[PDB]
Symmetry: C5
Subunit: 25 residues, 5 copies
């Protein structure tokens, strides 16, 4: 399912943004 992969990639993007915020803070 393409939607499942889209959701998984968005979750990965959320994790990467969290890591970026932690690095900046």
């Amino acid at each position: 399912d393409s939607q499942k992969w889209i959701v998984f990639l968005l979750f990965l993007i959320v994790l990467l943004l969290l890591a970026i915020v932690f690095l900046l803070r």
Copy 2:
């Protein structure tokens, strides 16, 4: 799936706004 995408995009917007505040 649409609700998941909307919720994750809202989280992304929140995190990007936090990054913008951190830069400034």
Copy 3:
């Protein structure tokens, strides 16, 4: 439908990334 919501959120993301680019430049 949620498609308009997704489009609006992505537009907000584009604006935020533009702001990030502007802050990085100056």
Copy 4:
């Protein structure tokens, strides 16, 4: 078509992220 606009916005996001990477590199 909303899918076309979603793809267009994602492409703009990719270009902006590439510009950010170039600025930070």
Copy 5:
């Protein structure tokens, strides 16, 4: 299809964010 383009662009975004994290750590 449009779904394939969305998946490909999200994968590119993931790669770019990974590069950003690598730069921040480096």
